[PDB]
Structures are given as C-alpha cells and as structure tokens.
Amino acid sequence: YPDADGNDVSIIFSGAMSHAIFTYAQSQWNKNIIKLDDYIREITLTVPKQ
Amino acid sequence: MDVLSKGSLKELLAHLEKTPLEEAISYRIGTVPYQNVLISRNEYYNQLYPDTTSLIDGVSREGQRNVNGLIMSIISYVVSGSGHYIPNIGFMLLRRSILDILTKHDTGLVTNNLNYGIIARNLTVSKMNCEQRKRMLICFKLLAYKDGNQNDYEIYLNQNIPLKQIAPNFIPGDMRTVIHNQDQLAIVGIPLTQSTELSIRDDNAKSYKLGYVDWYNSNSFLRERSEFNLIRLKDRDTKYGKLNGW
Amino acid sequence: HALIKEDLGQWPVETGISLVNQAGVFAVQLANKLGIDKPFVLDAGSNYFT
Amino acid sequence: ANRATSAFLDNPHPVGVNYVDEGSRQFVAVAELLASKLIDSSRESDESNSDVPFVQAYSKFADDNPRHLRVKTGGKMANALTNVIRSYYSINAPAIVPQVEIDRLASKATVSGDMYNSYAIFNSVPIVEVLSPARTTVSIVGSDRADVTMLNTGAGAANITFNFGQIAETVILKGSVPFQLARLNQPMPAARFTYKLRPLDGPFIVVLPVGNPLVISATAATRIQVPLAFNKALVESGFQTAMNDGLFDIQNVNYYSSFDEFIISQYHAQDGINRVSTCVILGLALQAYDQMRRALPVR
Amino acid sequence: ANRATSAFLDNPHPVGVNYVDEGSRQFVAVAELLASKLIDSSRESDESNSDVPFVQAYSKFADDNPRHLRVKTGGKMANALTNVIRSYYSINAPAIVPQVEIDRLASKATVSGDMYNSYAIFNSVPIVEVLSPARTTVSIVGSDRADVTMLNTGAGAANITFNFGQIAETVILKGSVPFQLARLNQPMPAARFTYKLRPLDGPFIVVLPVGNPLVISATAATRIQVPLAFNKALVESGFQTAMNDGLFDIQNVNYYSSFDEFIISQYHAQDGINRVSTCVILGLALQAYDQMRRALPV
Amino acid sequence: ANRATSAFLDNPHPVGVNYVDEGSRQFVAVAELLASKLIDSSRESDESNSDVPFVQAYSKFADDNPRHLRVKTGGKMANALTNVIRSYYSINAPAIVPQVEIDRLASKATVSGDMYNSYAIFNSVPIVEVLSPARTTVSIVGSDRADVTMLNTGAGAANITFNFGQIAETVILKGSVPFQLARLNQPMPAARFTYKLRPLDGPFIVVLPVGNPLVISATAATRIQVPLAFNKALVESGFQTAMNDGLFDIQNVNYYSSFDEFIISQYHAQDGINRVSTCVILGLALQAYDQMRRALPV
DSSP states (O other), rough: BBBBTTTOOOOOOHHHHHHHHHHHHHHHTTTOHHHHHHHHHHTTTTSSSO | OOOOEEEEEEEHHHHHHHHGGTSSSSOOOBBOSSSEEEEEOOOOOOOEEEEOOOOSSSSSSBBBBBBBHHHHHHHHHHHHSSSOSSSOOHHHHSSSSHHHHHOOSTTOOOTTOHHHHHHHHHTTGGGHHHHHHHHHHHHHHHHHHTTTTEEEEEEEEHEEEEEHHTOOOSSSSSHHHHHHHHHHHHHHOOOOOSOOOSSSHHHHHHHHHHHHHHHHHHHHHHHHHHHTOOOOTTTOOOOOOOOOOO | OOOOOOOOOOOOOSSSHHHHHHHHHHHHHHHHHHHHHOOOOOOSSSSOOO | OOOEEEEEGOOOOOOOOOOOSSHHHHHHHHHHHHHHHHHHHHHHHHHHHHHHHHHHHHHHHHHOOOOOOSSOOOOOHHHHHHHHHHHHTTSSSSOOHHHHHHHHHHHOOOOOSSSOOOEEEEOOOOOOEEOOOEEEOOOOOOEESEEEEEOOOOSSSSEEEEEEEESSSSEEEEEEEEEEEEEOOOOOOOOEEEEEEGGGGGGGGEEEEEEOOOEEEEEEEEEEEEEEEOOHHHHHHHHHHHHHHTTTTTTOOOOOOHHHHHHHHHTTSSTTTHHHHHHHHHHHHHHHHHHHHHSOOOO | OEEEEOOGGSSOOOOOOOOOOSHHHHHHHHHHHHHHHHHHHOOOOOHOOOHHHHHHHHHHHHHSSOOOSSOOOOHHHHHHHHHHHHHHHTTSSOOOHHHHHHHHTTTSOOSSSSSEEEEEEEEEOOOEEEEEEESSSEEESSSEEEEEEEOOOOSSSSEEEEEEOSSEEEEEEEEEEEEEEETTSOOOOOOOOEEEEEEOOOOOOEOOOOOSOOEEEEEEEEEEEEOOOOHHHHHHHHHHHHEEEEEEEEOTTTSSSHHHHHHHHHHHHHHHHHHHEEEEEEEEHHHHHHHHHHHHHO | EEEEGGGSSSSOOOOOOOOHHHHHHHHHHHHHHHHHHHHHHHHHHHHTTTSHHHHHHHHHSSSSSSSSSSOOHHHHHHHHHHHHHHHHHHHSOOSSSOHHHHHHTTSSSOOOOOSSSSEEEOOOOOOOEEEEOOEEEEOOOOOOOEEEEEESSSSSEEEEEEEEEEEEEEEEEOOOEEEEOOOOOEOOOOOOOEEOOOOOOOOOOEESSSSSSSSEEEOOOOOOOOOOOOOOHHHHHHHHHHHHTTTTSSHHHHOSHHHHHHHHHHTTSTTTTHHHHHHHHHHHHHHHHHHHHSSSSS
C-alpha cells in the first residue's frame, strides 16, 4: 500500500531478527541519502564566495 | 518573497493581479505596531539594542477592521513582504486580487475618504528607502485615480518635495506609460554574508535577501505539490453571500 | 501440529575465545548474506499480483 | 481573619502568544539538537587539538564558516533563538523574528516537534491561601520546601485552613511536633508527624494548640508534559543565564528564582492550562540557549 | 527535660521481605538495563526519521511488537516491575507475583555486577534527639538541611544535648552567630562559626546564651553500598512518580518526601542493616520505573 | 546597631599554590577522562558478558593489570590524584607528588588543560553584612537559600541595610509579606513581594514596619569560568566523598557544606580572584575522584 510520501509499504510475514536487521540497515543508509538541492548547498559552503 | 523580487512596474502590477488578498493579510497576532523595545544583538553589543517597532518590519502586527487597515496591510506586503492581522475579513474580499482592491469598484470597499498624509505617517515613510517609497506611491496613485481624487495626490506630493522627486511617471488609465516605464523597484535579488544587522527592518530585509537564492530553486516542486488538485482561490465562483462590516 | 521457524543459520561459538570477537566476525558474514553491507535502497514495489 | 500566600504565586505576568505553532516548535527542536552537537564537537576539538570537528558543527549551526577577524556568536540562528526566548516570557516583549527565517531554520534537521512525548516532575509547593483567626500569626517561607510557622496566643486552640490549589498531584506535610489535620467536616485523627494529602480533595483544617509554635514543612510534586529531550539540569542553568544576560528585563514582569517556580506560578493562573504549553516551549529554548553559550564563550 | 526529634526519623514502617534473593535481584538489574536501552532508543527515534531502535528496544522489553492502535503498556516486565515495587515498600503489600515469572524475565539479559559493588552519598541529616532544660525551647525543621532554632529565657546559660546517631559519617554544623560546642564531659572551646563532627564521637553539648535566639544549620553525609548503575537523580524522580501513581498507598505505612529520607529512616532503626539491603533494591527498581515510564507514558 | 553576616563567608583559609601549571592541569584533565571510561566500562561489561572491557580501562588508568587477590586501588594515578587534591585545599598541605610523575601521567591521553572555555552557575547567596538599628533582631539562616528573619520591637519603622558584595551577578528577594526596598538615596516604591537587583548597584535599604516579623528569602546566581568537562553533580559528590575520606583533614582550615559554598567564600576574600582559578581545578580533580572511587571502592 502507498504511504503519505509516495513510498511503497510492503506488509509480509517475516522473521523478527530478519526484520530488525534489514530495516535498521535501511535507516542507516537513508540517513545519508539527501536531495540534490541540499547537496549543492553543502558544496557551496566549502568553496569561495565567487 | 515573490513580491519583493519584481523590478519593473509591469512585473509588480502583474503580480498584484494574480495574487489574492489572502497573502496580503496574515493570521498571526504579533504585537502593538509602535513601541520602544530593547532587542538582543549579541554579534555587536553585550547590552540590549534599542529600537522602535513599526509596520514596515516583515512581521505581523495588529490592525483595525477598516479600509485604512486593509490599505495599510496591502502596502506593507508590497514594501516589506509581510502583511498584518486584520480579524475576520471575509471570504468575498479574500478571494479578490490585490489590484482589484486598489483599482476596481466591484470589490465593495469605499476608499474615497483615505488621507494619504496619515497613511504615510502610520507606515513610517521617513524610515523607507528609495524603492519602498516608489512602491507606496504606486499604490497611492492607483487609489487616487480609482476614486477620482487625483488632485489630492498632487497636493500630497507638493507638501512632500522629496517624494515628488522620485514619484512614478505612469498614469493608471493609460497603458503606454506602464509599457515604457523604466523604474527599478526590486528589493530582493540575487547578488552578502550570513551576518546580523542592527535594525529590525535591516535584519528582516537581509533575511529575505539571503533566502531568495534558496527560494529560487525550492519553491517550484513544493508549490506544485500543494495545488496539484486544488481549485484556484482567486475570483472563486460562489453564491455571493454577504460583505459584513464594510 | 504446525509451527513457523526462522532459519538464520547455525553459528557455533567457542567458550574460551571472546564472544564479542566472534560476534563481530559473524556480523560481517551475516551482512554479506543479507546483502546490506553496501549502500542500497529496497525496490520491492513491483513484486505483487492482482 | 488573616490571609497568607506564597510569594511566587502572586500575580503571574502574561506569557507570549507568538511562536507557538508547529513550525516554531520545530525551530526550537532543531536548535536544541544542533546546540547539543556543538557542545560535543567542542569537546572533541579540545581532545584532538583540531578545529575540524568544531568547524563542521559551527557550519551546520550558523551556516557560515568561522573566520579569525570576526566574532563567533552563533550567526542568524543564535539571533533568532535569543529574541524568541524574550517573546515567550512576556506579552510586552516584541516579536521581531520573521517567519521566513523560522521556516528556513526549521529545515536544518528532521525532528518531531511534538512537546507531549514525556513528562517531568516539578517540586514547587503551591500554598494558595492559609486562613487564620485573629489571635494567631502565620508566616510562609520557601518555594521548593515551604515552611509555615504558626503561633497561637489566644486562650483556646485555633483552626487554620490550608489551600494547596487543585493542580498539585501530591503534597506531604511534616511537623516539628505531632499535629492534628483533617478535611472539611471530618473527625480529627490522633496526632501524627507526617501526612500525605491530595490537593484536589479539599481544604484542610489544622488544630493549633496554645503552647508552642508549630512549623509545618510542605513538599509537593506535580506532573507536566514535556518533550523527550527535556532535561531539568540544562533548563535551570539556561534560566539563570538568561536572567543574568538581561533577556528578561521587560517592563511590568515578575521575576522568579528558578524555572520550577515560573512554570508552577503560571499554571495556577486563570488560564494556566494554556500558559504551561508556552512555558514548556520556552524551557526547550532555554536548554538550547544553555548549550550554545557554553560552547561559544563571551566574557 | 524536653526532647525534639526529626520528623522523618519517627517510626519507620517494616519493609517487605520477598523478592530479595539472588534471582530476584538479577531481575531488577536486568529491568534497569533494559529500560535504559528503551529511553536511549526513544531519543534516537525522535532525533531520526525512522523508528527501528524503539521497535527493537520495546520488543526486548515487552516480549511483543509495538502497535499503532494498542497502547504501549510495557509488557509483562512493566507489570512485574510495578508489583515488586509495591511489595518492597511495606510488609503488608500483597506480593503475589510468581517467582517463575521473575526468573523468566531475569534471563533476558545478563549483568556483570551485584548490589554491593559501589557506594552512594545520602545528604539527609539524622537528629535522633535534642535534649534541653526546662526554660529553653527547641524547634527542628528540615531534612536536607536541618535548622534547629533554640531560645533561652531563663536566668543563665543552658546546655543543649545533640544526638546525631552512630550511622552518619560526618555532620557539619553552622550557626547564625558564633557558638560553643564540645563533646560530653569535655572542656568547651572558644566560639566559632562552623564545626565538623563525627557522630560516633558522642553526644555533643552546645552552650546557649540568654538573649537573641541561635539557629544552627546541620548538613550530614552518609555512605550506603549500592550497585554501580545507581543514579540518585533517576531514583529520586522515580520515587515521586511511584507516589503519584499510587504504588505506596498501603495501610499503616509512613510517607517520606524523598528517597534519601526513606533510606536514612530505615537505616536509623533496629535491624536497620538488613533493611537498607531491600531499600537499595527498591531504589534500583525505581530507576527502571522512571526510565520505562518516561519512554512509555500512560 | 548590630551587624550580621553569612556563616560560610567567615574567614576563608588560603588555598594551595602548587599543581596549577599547564602540565598539572593536563594531569587533572587526563585523570577525569580516564576515570570516566572506568565507569562506562561497567556497562560495556554487562553487554559483552565479560570483564575484558573493565580490564582494559583499569590497565590504562593504573599501568598494571587487575588482580583477583589484590584490592583494586588505581595505582600511581589514584595515589597522585589523592595527594594533589590535598594540596589544593590548604597551603599547609605538602606537595608530595613530583613533577616528573605528573608529566608521565599527563601523557596518557591527549587533552588541553584549558579551564576557561566555559562557565557555570553557583547558587550560594553572599550576605556580606546586614546593618540594623537598636530594638531590631536580624537572623541569617541558610547558604543556598538565605532566610533573613527581621523583628521590629521599636516604636517606629526601622531602616535595615543589605550588602550583597560586588561579585554576585543577580539576587532575587522574596518576602513573606510585601515590603519596601530601595537603593541608597532613592525613593521607596509600593510594597511588592519580589525584587530583582544587581549587588553592584549598591547597599539596599529595606523598610521594616512594627508588628509581625518579616522574613526575606534570597537567591543569587554567580558565573564562574570552568572547563568544558565540568559537571556540578559529579563535583558536589566528589566534595562529600573527599571530606569523608579525610582528604581535607588538616590543621587551621575551614569546613564547608558544599563546593558551592567553598568557591563563593574564596571568591569573596581579600583577593578572591587569585583563589578562583585554584578552586576550579580542585573541582575537576574532585569530579575525577568521585568517578574513580565509585568504580574502585576502598
């Protein structure tokens, strides 16, 4: 089923540690996935004003 | 933020025709307009910095429910980017555009008794730059020609010689004047360091200046998501219920 | 009778040797088996039937 | 009859009505998170003898790379936070921070702005009204632990009425000597040393003998909903820093010894249930303020 | 002669006798450890955009997964923790939790420590008795900082006897004006402002001149053996929550303002050495109750 | 005319002058850092089901591996930290620890002994003097919240002068009943419950009406520069632990209830600025001591 942000949520029967380990890893990688506009802002702070 | 980037009389007039009155007004109480306050500017001084609040700061303030209050809110939006808190304006007025409030008789608002000298004092025209004064005079001229008080506009200009020097050279009825106008009314624009200014007006204005570069790119997608399946509010068709208190 | 079992494999551990050391070595193997050691985004919105 | 009340509950000044929406709550939450990262980066910089951890944290906070000739005060985020703190304290404080700034600063991090995840316990004891007859003298001293000294001069034993309000959850009374306490229209039990009372239960009558002065020590505990990042030690330290720096020097306002008294005094107002929500937001801002100044020292 | 004692030192009620063995002690340590991981996980989930750390922390703590519709009760661990706190306070508490359930919950984690590994300092000042002559009046008010107000209205100077017990390590006495204090049957020294005493040195005599009243402020420090995970800030807040939630409303029990007062009162009683062992276990349980409740309010 | 003063502000004893240089300051910073790792090693041991994390932490702190037949003491750093704390309290205490030993222990971890990169708030209210006329009784009780009891037995109203020193930043006064207070040569305002005032402004006059006693509660806040690793809760516990262990037991010194009173009393001396720097370094050493002794009781 779809979520509010447009992501797809899959509800399945699965194990406990398999769910915990896999979903935690998703959170860690997603912490470092950012929009291109935010990346440009980060780049601009590390270069001279021109 | 969009109203401040317009640098021509054509673009400013086009924006006002598209923008409804809802974005000119605000829904936040704010504080009393004129008041001597101490503000914290720790980048410069350890002591609190004295200043006076006004209606030109880009911060909402309380406004009365009258035509004078509505006019003041519209002008503040044009010259500062933020309006004022006028309680319970009504659906009929909010759906009309800013220009129609200024230049049309079908809005249901009487503006024949407006006093231009009092409005300028209430808007603190003394602490305005060249661009802001020009925008205020554009709104004054539009109201003057709408109600036929073109003479009173000239009397006000004659009493204030500095404003007469920088007055706009367009006639509201004619279109050749708008097409050939060469004024520069832009306040915000792409160039400034991320620093703090002493005055409330200067600090708030610089906040708009620093946020314009980011707003130029981020507003497109976020806006389109909001009104993907939404009916436009401007001149929305309705049963024409009533106009209360005006 | 019926039951549900989560099969994550069998990972023996020696008592004398340090448990944290063995757990860390097994963690690298488990992450490789689950395919979550390298940056990834889950793409599981297409596997459905109507 | 004579009336005595706690000093800190007298005439609480109105609090700010601005910067209380969802966007402003996010801005305070973002500031608190980023202020904490600043103080951790300052410890790492001292340990490693490098400016790399501090430069990264200051850039995320002030959106401006530190410079030698200028002065590091936190940038635009510090300016907004300090002036917003003033607005919460009193209505007479101005609102000068525009909302383009608040929305821009609220987007620097992802945090839930909800201020009702958790709870906290505040120890200020509210004694709204103590009523004594003509022959007795009553004195109330204290905020965290209230000491009530009563002396009876008249011929017979007197009845003293205690009113602890309706907001405090529990109140524990202790006496220097055993004393008799009961409810309205209830039999008096035998003299005991300590009583546990519910302020909602009703006014309490204390039988005061004529012999020697009786001192009653009161301690209270009340529950107020706070965000999960709330820390009382940091909030209290932030409160004193704001008072010392002069952020609370507004006309026609009341001054309090600690944040404990401020929130409880505001709670007991006519519309206190709405004033506490603003105070909790001010508490989070003060905690952000504390962490920020300790990381960037100015003498 | 007149006798004045501290209010919180009067009649300590008997403390419960169940759930004090090695297995039950292990359960409190595990509950404290698991609750700490719960509150730390809740903060990270709020800081981040995803709720994985809280889901795992609650699953371990409650033996079931969180649900958006059902309320987060805390599981059987929360239920067992609540009931053992009731039993520890008074001997009249029910104490009907099965021991097999306690052992099952204690096997969730393992703890490398005991309840005597460390120590903590408790600031309540014990004033067992203050003995005064016929004409003087003495009033004792306060637990964290005792304030003894003495006034002499007789012909000449009187002698006030102070008994601080034998349990406290050091007591510091400060006076509004300089005063003289000495041990029993010893010469008196010149007047000073502050005295430092060892309560085991013996009863102390104070010279009270005739005139303006003298107020003496007493601060004491006591050392009690506690586990290394002990935290007075968390225990004190947990004590208040337990009182507000009504875990201590039992008949024929005494009520104290702070856990510091509760543990000192039990220590200053006959068989008080055996009582502090159960009070320390109760203190660690209150630490788990605080962290669990702040993460899962109900 | 009588005068009254706070008890804790009387006769501050001189502090030590050794172990203040950069190398000794870095020794205290290293000791605090390594002692903190000792406490956290307990939680690591619980999670790891083994004592290896504790053994690593103690080996770095003591240069020797832990033994089962020996009581863990901390070795050279524990001995150095204990003796250094003694020297800080009094100038009569010997400086036993050699410089070479200090430099060797300071090289264990990388720190900067900067004690001026942060601040702290100290709540001891200084009342240097309270001047009252005849037929007026004034009593000052308390150190963190000072209560001043005032009685006017005279015929008319009396004027009482307050002097809060020149160091405290703010003082808030709350009275039992509304009272009048104003600076010298200023008119009096309407009676109010609460006054906020800066002690630097000048001596304050309070009008005492004839009748029931008037009690004023004073709360003060002072800012003192401290290192970023400063923690008031740990410093306060370390002060009580050191006093119990007898580290402050030396002739011709004064005894204070808390570290809050000690530092403020020294700051109000003849030249209090000279002693503030040493007192803060003593605070960091005490914070290291509390952590070290709680992990390794002896």
